[PDB]
Amino acid sequence: HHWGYGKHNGPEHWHKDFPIAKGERQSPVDIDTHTAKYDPSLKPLSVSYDQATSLRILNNGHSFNVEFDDSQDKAVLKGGPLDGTYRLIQFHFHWGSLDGQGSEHTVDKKKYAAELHLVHWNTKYGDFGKAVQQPDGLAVLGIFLKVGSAKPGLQKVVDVLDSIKTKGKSADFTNFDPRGLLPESLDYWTYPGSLTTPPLLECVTWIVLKEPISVSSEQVLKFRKLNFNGEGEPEELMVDNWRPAQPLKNRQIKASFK
């Protein structure tokens, strides 16, 4: 039926509707710390989220994402392994039924409690729609969440979730500065991949940060109260909305740090 994260419509069934699920540059992957190659040519990430314009927060039945106004070159990402400018369009998360799982990428098979994705599209393509048709159309910044002390910047997100519990619910979410979601260090691993949810197009350059951000179990707990279902339907908890590691195939993961 329609895709989901369930046993009958989840990850292992996607290939029937999206044959590319069995492609050559599918994401996510496991990051083996000693087959990853340090590449000294990799420049540092250049982030300019100081003029980001959040618009709203929405539960789409798969996750919840915050939309931004990507009309101007306000919040852009560049540097790193990228050529050109990428515009921030939205961010969302993946989490699990328990703290010990939830991230999509793993480091040496280690899973994190969650994973945040800041999605950006290559401006030379004119728009998000055309960009996803290109192998270099999107740049996704991936950030791991570990349970520890609270992240002050995630507090505003965690608090509004209550009012968008079921699929279809939206809320004006203005003035949220995504800079409070970033770790101290910008060291990263990078590899060519895909979108982790259908259509699973292989149009993404992945940038996964080495340093995870800490969030309190209190904060993580709130993600688990969202529902996959719409209002007035069989209540099914939004948990374990993550896709498992895919074969790395002929790819090499590069590290910006020795």
Positions at the binding site for Zn(2+): 92, 94, 117
Nearest to Zn ion of 111, 117 (CB atom): 117
Name residue, tokens 């250049």: 46
Contact predicate 215/151, CB 8 Å: yes
Cα Rg for the chain, rounded, in angstroms?
17
Nearest to Zn ion of 31, 124 (CB atom): 31
Nearest to Zn ion of 64, 173 (CB atom): 64
Residues at the binding site are 92, 94, 117, 196-197
Structure tokens at 121: 């599209």
Neighbours of 45 (CB within 10 A): 21
**Shortest Å, Cβ 143 to Zn ion:** 11
Which residues partner with 86 through β-bridges? 77, 122
Residue nearest to Zn ion (CB): 117
Tell me how far apart the alpha carbons of residues 98 and 248 are, in angstroms, rounded to a whole number.
26
**Shortest Å, Cβ 197 to Zn ion:** 6
**Shortest Å, Cβ 34 to Zn ion:** 26
Interface residue list for Zn ion (CB under 5 A): 117, 196
Structure tokens at 249: 């195939």
**Shortest Å, Cβ 71 to Zn ion:** 23
- Which residues, 6+ apart, have CB-to-CB distance to 208 below 8 Å? 31, 105, 142, 143, 144, 188, 189, 190
Tell me how far apart the alpha carbons of residues 246 and 26 are, in angstroms, rounded to a whole number.
6
Identify the active-site residue in 8, 13, 15, 62. 62
Neighbours of 27 (CB within 10 A): 22
- The yes-or-no answer on residue 15 being catalytic is no
Residues at the binding site for substrate are 196-197
Nearest to Zn ion of 146, 234 (CB atom): 146
- Active centre residues (catalytic): 62
